[PDB]
Structure formats: structure tokens, C-alpha cells
């Protein structure tokens, strides 16, 4: 029934499509991004999404515990997934904090990013219309930098705590608490609006973008590939782990959703249609963003790669500009940020719900019902609030960029995808798993799925992983700022926190199990109830 379809659609369609994909594509020069993007999509993305859903549906266990019924030895995959979601939920909601701040700033006769008579603006401001007539800055960019973000000169300078963004984070976390606690904002007929309006606004933005003068230059930037860049491991990791991010895999959240589905339900077609929806909205909203970028390039007289931030703020530069080019800008500003809030908040609801269902399944003795499950959820939300609050400082953009790069992205996703596919294909067995799928959905996976799990996904993950280490380049925030070495170490700390769960859980399970080593391994390789 459509509870599953709606849960998945609202979960893994979200800010990954509207906000992350455009900025990673822009960061990597546009067209070159799509080749590895589609290679990963059809090699690993859809098959691993189906794999996660099928694990969940087969075991009827949530995220961590399903591996006890498939391969206990590699139970560390579940803990790695859950900690990945723990960090994602910490940093992902800061985007909703920014969206809330923008929305409250929309309630004006004139939008604050339309011109720079305002106080925060540098003396070097030039209103974008007149620039074509020094290091001038656009009001749309420096609203983002100096009012919303109040950007510190570096991560080494935390600066003050933004007392307004703190309450924006508090508001969105309260919304998450009351939605997950009471179960509100799901399964109702109101979902007819909640699931449809965001795509309507995306269509409005796309129609605006494609009609702006200079859109064609942006689309050429978007679709023409410079094969030279591909030589750099950066585009490959960015695209492949953007696939893994956008599909919410390696989180165990999709596995958690699958655990609620009936054992004999045929999910394959639904999974393929949902994947089409996800990758399609990403690719299509690419045309919305890059048309606006081409328009800005034509208006200001600078190359497309120079017009905006090569980073997280790309959406908060581009769409704010677009809504300024429409009748009654305040109306469309409010609608844009309500669309962004709804689209991200359901993906936040799904991710937090998956985290909680995965965690309560470990100890159902406690955490049973509203008498204590509500308190556990409240504790999780409070902790995630205090951690996300670090990104609300003036230096918070650098911390957010470090989180977005390392904590739930990059090699840590490749690691989990590799081990999931490797376990199922070679430790458990493709022959066993295809028979299980035949028992559940009624027909075997077929060769695309079987070989994607057996060879293609492991090969792609290992290739990108090793390629990024042979041709290493460090992180930079906006192509100028270089992180200090301790910040790079912190990013690797975040990534390794997720990755090391597999080795350490393996050793923890080899210990405390009885008997010689051989029987220990054989016992841990054997499923359990």
C-alpha cells in the first residue's frame, strides 16, 4: 500500500536533489559530473537501493538487527549505517535552519537580497544590473555571506553564536519532535498537498530559469563534458557518493522502511519507479539551477564558473535570484522556502524515524512505547540540536562544509556499499539471496542486479576509493579557502567514526564467542533468528 511508496518518496527525494546535486555539479565544472554520475547510477545506485529495501523486507528487522539474520559476522555494517544517519541528521537540519531564516526574511515589502541599501553590505557592493557598465560583490551573494551566514574568516575563528539561527534550529527540531512523537504529518489526505506542491514549485522555477536570457550558456556548461577533469578523482567520488547520498543508502533508513513491508509484497517495480523519480528530479532541477547561473553570467559579464559559490550556498544564491525575477517577488520567495522546508522536513522525518526504529530494535525491553520511547526521541533530538548548534556560529559554514564532505559522504559511503554488496554476493551468496527474493517477490533478481552486486558495485567502490588516495587533493570551502590540517584530521575523524564500526564489531563478535577460531568464524557466518 501507498504508505511505503509515500514514505520512500518523501524520504529520499529532498535537499539532496534540490540543493546538493547542483552545487556538486557546479563545483566540478558541470558536464563532466554527469558521466560518472550515470555510471554510478545504473551500476550501483538502483541495485543497492533495491538491496537495502530487500534486506529490510526479508528480515523484518530494522537497520542494525537485519544483519543478524543474514551474516552476523558483518553486523558492523548496521552500526556504521546508523552512525552515518546520526551525523547526517545532525548536519542536514542546518539547511532547514537557513531555509527558515530566509522564509522569515521573506515577510517584507521588498526582499533584502534584491538591493544593497541595507547595512550589512560591503562598500564594494554593485547591484547586479549595473555591474556590466574592481572586486565588486553581488547583493544576492553578500546577503548570504554577511546577513544570513555572517561568515567568519575561517574555521579557526568560531566567532559568536547567531542567536536567530539558533532559534531557527530550535523551531525545526521542535517540528521534528512533534511529528515523530505523535506520528503527525503522515498517512493523511493532507499528504496530497505535501507530496505534490514541491514539484509544482520546482516546475515554476524551471520555467522561470529556461526563459531567462542567457540560459543556453548555462545549459551548455551543464551538459558539455570536459573529459580532462575526469582525470581527477574528485569528480568520481563526488558523483558516486552523490548517488549514494541522494538514494539514502548506507544509512539503513531504506532498510528500516522495508522492514515494515509485507514479506510477499512485490517491491521491484515500485523501487524502479521511485528511483526514476529521484534521479529525474535531480537531473531536471539541474536545468533550473544552471539556467539561472547562465543568466547571471550574461548579466554580470563573468564566466559561469565565477558567478556563484562553488559550495553549499549555491541554492541560496541561485533561487533567491530567480524569485527576484518574478512578479511580486515576496509571494514566490515565501512559496520557494515553504517548498524547500516541506521537501527537506519529510526527508528529515524519514531519516530520524529510521534512526529511532533501528535503535529501539536493539533493546525492545526498554524503549517500548510512549511512556519512554517519547523520552528517548526527545533525548536524541536534544543531543542533535546541541551538535548542530556548532554550525550556527559565525564559523559554522566551514564546520558544515566539513560535515557535508566527510561525515555522510565520500569514502564512508563507498565503504558501506562495498561491504553490503560483498557480503550478500560472496559471503551469504547470490544463489541464496536470489532464492530468497524469488520466495518473496516471486521472481529472481536477474543478471543486472546479480552482477551489479557481484562485480560492478564492488569494483566501482574500490576503484574510486583507491583513486582518491593515489591522486589525493585536500578539501577547500569555496575554491579559495584552504582548511587547516587539524580540520582535515577532524574530517577524517568523522569519516572513520563510521568506517571503523565494521572492523571493531568484527573483533567484538569474534571475542566472547566460544570455541576455536575456525568454529567461531563458521558460527558467525551462519544466520540467526
Amino acid at each position, epitope marked *: 500500500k501507498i504508505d511505503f511508496v509515500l514514505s520512500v518518496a518523501g524520504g529520499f527525494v529532498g535537499l539532496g536533489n534540490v540543493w546538493r546535486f547542483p552545487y556538486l555539479c557546479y563545483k566540478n565544472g558541470g558536464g563532466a559530473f554527469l558521466i560518472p554520475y550515470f555510471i554510478f547510477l545504473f551500476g550501483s545506485g538502483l541495485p543497492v537501493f533495491f538491496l537495502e529495501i530487500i534486506i529490510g523486507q526479508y528480515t523484518s528487522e530494522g537497520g542494525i538487527t537485519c544483519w543478524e539474520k543474514i551474516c552476523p559476522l558483518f553486523s558492523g555494517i548496521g552500526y556504521a549505517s546508523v552512525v552515518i544517519v546520526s551525523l547526517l541528521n545532525v548536519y542536514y537540519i542546518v539547511i532547514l535552519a537557513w531555509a527558515t531564516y530566509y522564509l522569515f526574511q521573506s515577510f517584507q515589502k521588498e526582499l533584502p537580497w534584491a538591493h544593497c541599501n541595507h547595512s550589512w553590505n560591503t562598500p564594494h557592493c554593485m547591484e547586479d544590473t549595473m555591474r556590466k557598465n574592481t572586486n565588486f560583490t553581488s547583493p544576492v551573494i553578500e546577503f548570504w555571506e554577511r546577513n544570513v551566514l555572517s561568515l567568519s574568516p575561517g574555521i579557526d575563528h568560531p566567532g559568536s553564536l547567531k542567536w536567530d539561527l539558533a532559534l531557527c534550529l530550535l523551531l525545526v527540531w521542535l517540528v521534528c519532535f512533534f511529528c515523530i512523537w505523535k506520528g503527525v504529518r503522515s498517512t493523511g489526505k493532507v499528504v496530497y498537498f505535501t507530496a505534490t506542491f514541491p514539484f509544482a514549485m520546482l516546475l515554476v522555477l524551471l520555467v522561470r530559469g529556461l526563459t531567462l536570457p542567457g540560459a543556453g550558456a548555462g545549459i551548455k556548461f551543464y551538459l558539455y563534458p570536459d573529459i580532462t577533469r575526469l582525470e581527477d578523482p574528485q569528480v568520481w567520488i563526488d558523483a558516486g557518493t552523490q548517488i549514494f547520498f541522494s538514494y539514502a543508502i548506507c544509512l539503513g533508513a531504506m532498510t528500516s522502511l522495508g522492514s515494515y513491508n509485507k514479506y510477499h509484497n512485490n517491491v521491484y517495480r515500485d523501487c524502479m519507479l521511485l528511483g526514476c523519480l529521484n534521479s529525474g528530479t535531480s537531473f531536471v532541477s539541474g536545468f533550473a539551477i544552471f539556467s539561472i547561473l547562465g543568466f547571471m553570467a550574461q548579466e554580470q559579464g563573468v564566466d559561469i564558473a565565477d558567478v556563484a559559490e562553488s559550495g553549499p550556498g549555491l541554492a541560496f544564491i541561485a533561487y533567491p535570484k530567480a524569485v527576484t525575477m518574478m512578479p511580486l517577488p515576496t509571494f514566490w520567495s515565501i512559496l520557494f522556502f515553504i517548498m524547500l522546508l516541506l521537501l527537506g522536513l519529510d526527508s528529515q522525518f524519514v531519516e530520524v524515524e529510521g534512526q529511532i526504529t533501528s535503535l529501539v530494535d536493539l533493546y525492545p525491553s526498554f524503549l517500548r512505547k510512549g511512556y519512554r520511547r517519547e523520552i528517548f526521541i526527545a533525548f536524541v533530538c536534544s543531543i542533535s540540536y546541541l551538535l548542530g548548534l556548532t554550525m550556527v556560529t559565525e564559523g559554522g559554514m566551514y564546520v558544515f562544509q566539513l560535515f557535508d564532505y566527510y561525515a555522510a559522504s565520500g569514502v564512508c559511503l563507498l565503504w558501506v556499499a562495498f561491504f553490503e554488496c560483498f557480503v550478500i554476493a560472496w559471503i551469504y551468496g547470490g544463489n541464496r539471496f536470489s532464492e530468497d527474493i524469488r*520466495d518473496m517477490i*516471486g*521472481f*529472481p533478481p536477474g543478471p543486472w542486479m546479480k552482477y551489479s552486486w557481484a562485480v560492478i558495485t564492488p569494483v566501482l567502490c574500490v576503484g574510486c576509493f583507491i583513486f582518491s588516495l593515489v591522486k589525493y587533493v585536500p578539501l577547500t570551502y569555496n575554491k579559495t579557502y584552504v582548511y587547516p590540517n587539524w580540520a582535515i584530521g577532524l574530517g577524517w575523524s568523522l569519516a572513520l567514526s563510521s568506517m571503523l564500526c565494521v572492523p571493531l564489531v568484527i573483533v567484538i563478535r569474534l571475542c566472547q564467542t566460544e570455541g576455536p577460531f575456525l568454529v567461531r568464524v563458521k558460527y558467525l557466518l551462519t544466520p540467526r533468528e
Partner: antibody
Framework: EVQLVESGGGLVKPGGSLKLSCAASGFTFSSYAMSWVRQSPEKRLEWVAEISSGGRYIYYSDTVTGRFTISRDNARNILHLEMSSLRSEDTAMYYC????????????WGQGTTLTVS | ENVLTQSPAIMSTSPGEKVTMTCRASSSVGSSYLHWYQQKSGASPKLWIYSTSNLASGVPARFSGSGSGTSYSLTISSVEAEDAATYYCQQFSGYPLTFGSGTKLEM
């Protein structure tokens, strides 16, 4: 895919035991779920049991679930059905059928063996 | 046990006439999980239609299928002597698997 051939039909006393065989050829027998279907002297079809490709999932009809045991030999491409206590209603034509895909049905049927319990 | 029943248990017919057969289930059957089998007199059955409308490899194109939920049907544009057989519907949605009572076309 070409061929299925049953064997082992014959005459046994009421309450007796009998084992049927069904050889396969022309396809990788280990890759397809297999089923036995039963046709009474009244020509009515009745399903008996299913065994999946790896033999790990087995299903029985409610009228045989306590008395019939299904098994397969992937190393020899032969399918087996064993009846422990044959009731009078169990006399019928027995077909082994290839049923790998539930959305596609029984692709191929054997020639069948008659079972009599006079 | 989902009981399947076919109404026209026997069908007197002559060449050139159109035919439609009915198959009702005691419980709803998914569209992908209902099939029709032909059985010529004195020979083993053969798959005829699957997924409620997809014709098998050997069936002539004159056959067609339809249905949803609790009721299904199979039809012939025009019969011929080669079509004289017993046709069984079968649900494959859940165990025990069950065949319909069968309908025989007499000419």
C-alpha cells in the same frame, strides 16, 4: 529448455508408500523452482507441492502437508516426490512442472505418471 | 485456501463463433498472479496465458485475456477444431496454489 520426464508410477495398496521421480533435460535444473501438480480421475487439477531452486523453501497443499515430502537432486537434475501414507484419494496423474516465476506460471510440464491404489 | 471457480463448466461451440470464459476467486488475486492453461484431451497441460493477458509462446494470437481483483476471463476471437481442449485458470498469488474447476470446449 526442452524436456521433463516422470517415472515410478504404479500400483500400491491403500495406506502404502511410493516414490515418484522426474528427470529434467535441456535446461539448468538447479536454476528453476519445481512443482508437482495432480490430476484426479475426474480430470480436476490439484496442486501438491513446490520446492524452490535451492530446495530451501518448500510448500505443500493442505491435503498432503502431513504425508508428502518433496526433494530434489541438483547434482543429478532429477526431482523426487515421496508419499508416506497414500489415501484412496491420492490415485491420480502426477505432473512435474517448472514454476520458477510466479508471474509467469508453469512453463513446462512432464508427460506424467499414473498412480493407482486399487 | 483461495477457491477458484469457472462458471461455464462445459461449452458447446462450433467453428467461427467467439467465446469468453469466466474465472472467479473466493479472494482477490493480483493481476500478475493469474494464469490460464490449455490441456488437449489425453495430454498434459500447457501454459496458455500468463499475467492475465500475456499469451504464451505457442498459443495462436486469436486468444486474449482480461480481469482484475476477484474475477478474471479468457476469450477467443473465433474458435477452431484445434482449440477443442479443457482450459484451467490458476492463481499464483499465495499458497496453497489453486486451479479453477476447468472449462471444456466441445467442438
Amino acid at each position: 529448455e526442452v524436456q521433463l520426464v516422470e517415472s515410478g508410477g504404479g500400483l500400491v495398496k491403500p495406506g502404502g508408500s511410493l516414490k515418484l521421480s522426474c528427470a529434467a533435460s535441456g535446461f539448468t535444473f538447479s536454476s528453476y523452482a519445481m512443482s508437482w501438480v495432480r490430476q484426479s480421475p475426474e480430470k480436476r487439477l490439484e496442486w501438491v507441492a513446490e520446492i524452490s531452486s535451492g530446495g530451501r523453501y518448500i510448500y505443500y497443499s493442505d491435503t498432503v502437508t502431513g504425508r508428502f515430502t518433496i526433494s530434489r537432486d541438483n547434482a543429478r537434475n532429477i526431482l523426487h516426490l515421496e508419499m508416506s501414507s497414500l489415501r484412496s484419494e491420492d490415485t491420480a496423474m502426477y505432473y512435474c512442472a517448472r514454476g520458477e516465476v510466479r508471474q509467469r506460471g508453469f512453463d513446462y510440464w512432464g508427460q506424467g505418471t499414473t498412480l493407482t491404489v486399487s | 485456501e483461495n477457491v477458484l471457480t469457472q462458471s461455464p463448466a462445459i461449452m458447446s461451440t462450433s467453428p467461427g463463433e467467439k467465446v469468453t470464459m469466466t474465472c472467479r476467486a473466493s479472494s482477490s488475486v493480483g493481476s500478475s498472479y493469474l494464469h490460464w492453461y490449455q490441456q488437449k484431451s489425453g495430454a498434459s497441460p500447457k501454459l496458455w496465458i500468463y499475467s492475465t493477458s500475456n499469451l504464451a509462446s505457442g498459443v495462436p494470437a486469436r486468444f486474449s485475456g482480461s480481469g482484475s481483483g476477484t474475477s478474471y476471463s479468457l476469450t477467443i476471437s473465433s474458435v477452431e477444431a484445434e482449440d477443442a481442449a479443457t482450459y484451467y485458470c490458476q492463481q499464483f498469488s499465495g499458497y496453497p496454489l489453486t486451479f479453477g474447476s476447468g472449462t471444456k470446449l466441445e467442438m
